[PDB]
């Protein structure tokens, strides 16, 4: 009896947040206009999946909560509500299945037949086609009007178990399993081709669409499998009989919980990957040298102080690749000049390494740590003397570089200069050293 309240509270909560959630999602994707066509066509399929979820929450859930609340009470929705409850529930399972299949085809064609896709696909055609999806869904659901009926009050099948075993089997085959098999094959083949095509506005959309499709396909199996499993049992199939009763109950809730959380989830997940893509784009743009792309991303709201798995900020990559323009703009939008990575390298280490003179100047001008030492004990002057960048050694020494600094290997930059046959560079450190001796006295 106590559980009834607990289930009610949970079931009511799922209803209000589920209806409003899917409603907001429906109204949002409606207003939403994207320049990339596929972005739109993806959102059309995401609309009809939110509609399918909303219908089930408005029409089906309330009937269940009554069936749960009033156990073994008369069916109080008439023969119309009886036949209709299963029509809508069957009409939505088809709609969802045809959407995830239609979406996966459009996204397969995009990647694997682009110059066949360009000549076939359009926002208008997708919109007109998603109508056909809901028609087919309604026509495929018509048989459930005749299978279910009212008797003595129970909304129970009004047809033989033989004829009923057929429809349940035909339902589960192409409202599930067929879509699952088609979605996973097409999305796999496409995703493999996509990761190869990497090894532009349209190309961005594809990576988004493939993520979306893998997210909805995983969300589709977790929700509808225990349900369709439960259905499949009726067709084929004690003390555990009462224990297998819990599965039936658990499978219903799952369809509802999923349908209610998916909007709250998708939006939560979209935000994270939305920024994760911006940050990933900035790092690529910085290292590549697309000074244009960087400008756009920083305005968009990309994190100036992003990092790699290694701990390479954009300023590390720009300084390393020697993109003075990108270095200048990164510092302009408040990049950490003294930022460290795993090995403990600052940008000034990398600009002294590759030997970009003016970047070394800019980093120091914007307050770079001149003596900054890494894990191995190495400093920027070690690296300039190592590669023999005489001009960089000059400015480093000029900006208060420690000519004496030794590493873990017990080698100073003076030694490294000699050890690389850099006769000129070595001569400058000797001069610099004896000057430091005289001020020390
Ligand atoms: C022989 O059936 C099973 C055997 C083993 C496990 C089962 O479910 C966990 C089932 C099963 C499936 C359905 C099952 O899927 N009913 C429906 C439903 O979804 O509500 C009903 C009946 C038809 C038309 C329509 C849609 C389908 C199939 C309404 N109902 N159902 C059950 C039938 C009879 N007694 C059961 C007792 C227990 Cl403890 C659990 C399940 C039972």
**How deeply is 410 buried, as exposed, middle or buried, from its count of CB atoms within 10 A (0-12, 13-18, 19+)?**
exposed
Tokens of 13: 């909560």
Which are the contacts of 287, defined by CB distance < 8 A and separation ≥ 6?
314, 317, 318, 320, 321
Query: What whole-number distance in Å separates Cα of residue 433 and Cα of residue 306?
Result: 39
Name the one residue in this structure whose structure tokens are 């360009």.
118
- Is the Cβ atom of 233 under 6 angstroms away from ligand 1? yes
Query: What whole-number distance in Å separates Cα of residue 98 and Cα of residue 83?
Result: 23
Interval between CA 176 and ligand 1 midpoint (Å):
18
- Is the Cβ atom of 168 under 6 angstroms away from ligand 1? yes
Query: What whole-number distance in Å separates Cα of residue 306 and Cα of residue 390?
Result: 32
Could you tell me where in the chain the CATH 1.25.40.20 domains are found? 310-440
According to CATH, the superfamily of the domain at 2-237 is Rhodopsin 7-helix transmembrane proteins (1.20.1070.10)
Closest ligand 1 atom, residue 245 Cα: 39
Closest CA to 106 of 39, 28, 48, 49: 39
Query: What whole-number distance in Å separates Cα of residue 237 and Cα of residue 70?
Result: 27
- Is the Cβ atom of 230 under 6 angstroms away from ligand 1? yes
Going 187 to 190 to 196 to 202, the CA torsion angle's sign is negative
**How deeply is 196 buried, as exposed, middle or buried, from its count of CB atoms within 10 A (0-12, 13-18, 19+)?**
exposed
Please check whether the domain covering 310-440 is classified as CATH 1.25.40.20.
yes
Could you tell me where in the chain the CATH 1.20.1070.10 domains are found? 2-237
Per-residue burial over 64-101, b if 16 or more Cβ lie within 10 Å, else e, is bbebbeeeeeebebeeeebbbbbbbbbbbbbbbbbbbb
Name the one residue in this structure whose structure tokens are 């097409």.
186
Identify how many contiguous H helices and E strands the chain contains and give both numbers: 20, 2
Tokens of 73: 């009470």
- Are the C-beta atoms of residues 371 and 340 closer than 8 Å to each other? no
Query: What whole-number distance in Å separates Cα of residue 241 and Cα of residue 167?
Result: 25
Interval between CA 226 and ligand 1 midpoint (Å):
12
- Is the Cβ atom of 83 under 6 angstroms away from ligand 1? no
Residue 40 CB neighbours (<10 A)? 17
- Are the C-beta atoms of residues 217 and 51 closer than 8 Å to each other? no
Going 238 to 240 to 242 to 247, the CA torsion angle's sign is negative
Going 147 to 152 to 155 to 161, the CA torsion angle's sign is negative
Tokens of 147: 């299978």
Query: What whole-number distance in Å separates Cα of residue 14 and Cα of residue 21?
Result: 10
Closest CA to 88 of 46, 64, 55, 66: 55
Closest ligand 1 atom, residue 248 Cα: 9
């Amino acid at each position: 009896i106590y559980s009834k309240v607990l289930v009610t509270a949970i079931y009511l909560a799922l209803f209000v947040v589920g209806t409003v959630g899917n409603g907001v999602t429906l109204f949002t994707l409606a207003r939403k206009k994207s320049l990339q066509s596929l972005q739109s066509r993806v959102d059309y399929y995401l609309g009809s999946l939110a509609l399918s979820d909303l219908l089930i929450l408005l029409f089906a859930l309330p009937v269940d909560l009554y069936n749960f609340i009033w156990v073994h009470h008369p069916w109080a929705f008439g023969d119309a509500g009886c036949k209709g409850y299963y029509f809508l529930r069957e009409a939505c399972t088809y709609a969802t299945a045809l959407n995830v299949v239609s979406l996966s085809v459009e996204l397969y064609l995009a990647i694997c037949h682009p110059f066949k896709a360009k000549t076939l696909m359009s926002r208008s055609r997708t919109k007109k086609f998603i109508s056909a999806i809901w028609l087919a869904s309604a026509l495929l659901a018509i048989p459930m009007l005749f299978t279910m009926g009212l008797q003595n009050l129970v909304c129970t099948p009004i047809v033989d178990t033989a004829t009923l075993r057929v429809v349940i089997q035909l339902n589960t085959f192409m409202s599930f399993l067929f879509p699952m098999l088609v979605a996973s094959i097409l999305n796999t083949v496409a995703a493999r081709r996509l990761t190869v095509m990497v090894h532009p506005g349209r190309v961005q959309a594809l990576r988004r669409g493939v993520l979306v499709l893998r997210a909805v396909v995983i969300a589709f199996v977790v929700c509808w499998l225990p349900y369709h499993v439960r259905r499949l049992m009726f067709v084929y199939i004690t003390a555990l009989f009462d224990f297998y009763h819990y599965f039936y109950m658990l499978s219903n809730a799952l369809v509802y919980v999923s349908a209610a959380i998916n909007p709250i989830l998708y939006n939560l997940a979209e935000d994270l990957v939305e920024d994760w893509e911006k940050a990933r784009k900035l790092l690529e743009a910085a290292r590549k040298g697309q000074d244009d792309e960087v400008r756009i991303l920083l305005a968009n709201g990309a994190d100036v102080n992003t990092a790699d798995e290694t701990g390479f900020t954009p300023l590390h990559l720009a300084a390393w690749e020697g993109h003075l323009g990108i270095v200048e703009v990164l510092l302009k939008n408040g990049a950490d000049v003294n930022a460290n990575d795993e090995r403990g390298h600052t940008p000034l280490h990398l600009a002294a390494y590759t030997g970009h003179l003016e970047i070394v100047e800019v980093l120091l001008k914007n307050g770079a740590g001149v003596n900054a030492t890494d894990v191995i004990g190495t400093a920027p002057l070690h690296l300039a003397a190592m590669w023999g960048h005489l001009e960089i050694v000059e400015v480093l020494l000029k900006n208060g570089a420690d000519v004496n600094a030794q590493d873990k290997f017990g080698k100073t930059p003076f030694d490294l200069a000699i050890d690389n046959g850099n006769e000129d560079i070595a001569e400058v450190l000797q001069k610099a050293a004896t000057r430091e001796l005289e001020v020390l006295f």
